[PDB]
Structure 1
């Protein structure tokens, strides 16, 4: 329950606060090389917001980028960012779509045991149309954050591979149609486009309005039905590198289905390890 917060909710909760129930805004902007999320933050951001670096708060040994980090690493990261036991996290991003990389971080706090995490509707795109309540860097104090990762939130290469036979869960890919069909290139050097056999293409953009807001739960229910996805049966989301897949997990969450694991490795890992030849 209660996973998303509006542009007006956040304006009020700051001029609150409350006692034993703190707030902490986050700019989890992340882009494919095309924009500097940290420099853009320092130029323009929401008061109190600290920048959440998706590639920094990641597994330090993997050759893949923004793989879920270890429990001790996420505790040290979230802690130093102003997140504790009673903290209420609100994540946004300055993306053109409204929300893009923000649901990835929403999913991350949930996976490590901190369910007191919400998302800002429309992100910064709509924090512009609806008023203008900043510059600088940012300075929150620590933590004593505890992290216990629930592996039920993540699917591995082997799980996806073995599902090709078992069919125990539905797989939704949130990449653009072109990339999924194999008609548009992949943004990574040497990686070819295409998709995992038996997966459904539901691009992450289908979950949002042209305004950039999240579609209604009834609209998302209609989408899942039209794409031939049964929200009563198990569902796993995938994409290019495990970022926009969390939009699918969010869509299903707002429909009453919180158990939607993410294939963290996603297309880049699949292309590397399965080596599809066409």
Structure 2
């Protein structure tokens, strides 16, 4: 009876079942986040995670901040740790890593697949709209013409988003993908979505119809506030921003590659440097916008601040929230919209650390859900997420949409439109 860094105790199905409600037990899913979200990556008939399990992909073992990731997930040495993957062998390195860092109660559950996934009495959970947030393997099957799950279409396009930075695309992109400048779908004057006529033309010239499956992704290139356009380096926020606008416009099937370009190269797939010409289409095929409820403008937003069942969700940084900085080099006004609920995005206007993992995949949705709930951000309300100009609001909105929330919007104008009217009230300083 000694602590063994390399030999791990197995916990049986019956023991684990009896512990599903224990507050002192942490069930840890070491598969990829996409499998955790619900993708049936090994052909299992029930996808998702053991009910109550947290997500800690073994892929993160090479991250030097691994222990800080564990600690901010509130996984503590006094907890009983139960690990599972598709196989117990996939858990061994994670089990050892926990034991090397002072975690003495670590078990491996051997029978998640196919035992747990294959019996409907064993409770599981999943991200309700997981099929909109696709893994790299799905994209690779799509462009290769292979059969893939959650796809019944015959027309697709892979779109590499960027803000006036074609080099983000030309320096390496998914084979066959074409680039879309974010300026194609949003106006540099208002930083809102363009008019219906402009959206129709822009989508057609990029080869997109309403019945085209659009797969969006961007390249993270370490945004720097010292640069004139830091957004040129936050390509995957821009991709989700464009996903919002396309879904607003009326593209029926929009997917986002979870984690963006890094997920493609982390999977080891081939990259291309061809400047792929556009294959235009003549008619978009649906009235624009087909889903106008996704977009909230300033008059409705003011109404939502007065309504009991509605709220605006400020997805800005803390220095922006208290009026220390405006967040952007082209905005002078500092302050915040009075009455909005704060949901801190991350470090600045071009980072989403509170909504992402280190590899830029979306944060474990239960964590987003629970933090939001502590502030009264809940699905029974009509929610309009916003930020400076709508990029971060769109990513927060997308995370809520993935959870299946029935009334979530982006207040497009954000602080930029709000503060451009001097008659609009604003707060400043620490609350």
State the TM-score bracket (shorter-chain normalisation): 0.7 to 0.9
Cα deviation, 1:97-139, whole Å, max 9, x if unaligned, reads 7831111111112111222111011101222222141113221
Structure 1 residue 28 displacement after superposition: 1.4
Consecutive unaligned residues in structure 1, runs of 5 or more: 31-35
* Structure 2 partner of 1:55: 183
Based on CA coordinates, which of the two structures has the bigger radius of gyration?
2
- The change in CA–CA distance for 1:276 and 1:197 in structure 2 (over 3 A counts) is closer
* Structure 2 partner of 1:148: 288
Supply the distance in 2 between the matched residues of 1:275 and 1:232 (Cα, whole angstroms): 27
Quick check: 1:239–1:266 contact (8 Å CA) kept in 2? yes
Which of the numbers 119, 138, 144 marks the counterpart of 2:276?
A: 138
RCO higher in structure (CA 8 A, sep ≥6): 1
* Structure 2 partner of 1:246: 394
For these two proteins, the number of residue pairs brought into alignment is 270
Quick check: 2:379–2:406 contact (8 Å CA) kept in 1? no
Cα deviation, 1:165-189, whole Å, max 9, x if unaligned, reads 3344111111222112222342133
Quick check: 1:220–1:255 contact (8 Å CA) kept in 2? no
Are 1:25 and 2:154 matched, yes or no? no
* 1:102-141 equivalence runs, <5 A: 102-133=239-270, 134-141=272-279
Supply the distance in 2 between the matched residues of 1:20 and 1:261 (Cα, whole angstroms): 27
Three-state SS of the structure 1 residue aligned to 2:197 is helix
Supply the distance in 1 between the matched residues of 2:323 and 2:297 (Cα, whole angstroms): 23
Quick check: 1:57–1:77 contact (8 Å CA) kept in 2? yes
* 1:197-212 equivalence runs, <5 A: 197-202=338-343, 203=345, 204-212=352-360
Q: Structure 1 length normalisation: TM-score?
A: 0.88
Consecutive unaligned residues in structure 2, runs of 5 or more: 1-128, 223-233, 346-351
Supply the distance in 2 between the matched residues of 1:259 and 1:142 (Cα, whole angstroms): 34
Are 1:195 and 2:336 matched, yes or no? yes
Structure 1, 126-135 or 97-106: larger mean CA deviation? 97-106
Are 1:163 and 2:292 matched, yes or no? no
Quick check: 2:296–2:409 contact (8 Å CA) kept in 1? yes
Structure 1, 16-25 or 156-165: larger mean CA deviation? 16-25
Quick check: 1:152–1:261 contact (8 Å CA) kept in 2? yes
Quick check: 1:191–1:268 contact (8 Å CA) kept in 2? no
Supply the distance in 2 between the matched residues of 1:268 and 1:198 (Cα, whole angstroms): 16
Are 1:269 and 2:269 matched, yes or no? no
Supply the distance in 2 between the matched residues of 1:114 and 1:176 (Cα, whole angstroms): 31
RMSD of aligned C-alpha atoms?
2.3
Cα deviation, 1:159-218, whole Å, max 9, x if unaligned, reads 222333334411111122211222234213352232111212221431211221112332
* Structure 1 partner of 2:317: 176
Supply the distance in 1 between the matched residues of 2:157 and 2:288 (Cα, whole angstroms): 20
**Stretches (4+) displaced over 4 A:** 17-20
- The change in CA–CA distance for 1:210 and 1:152 in structure 2 (over 3 A counts) is same
- The change in CA–CA distance for 1:6 and 1:173 in structure 2 (over 3 A counts) is same
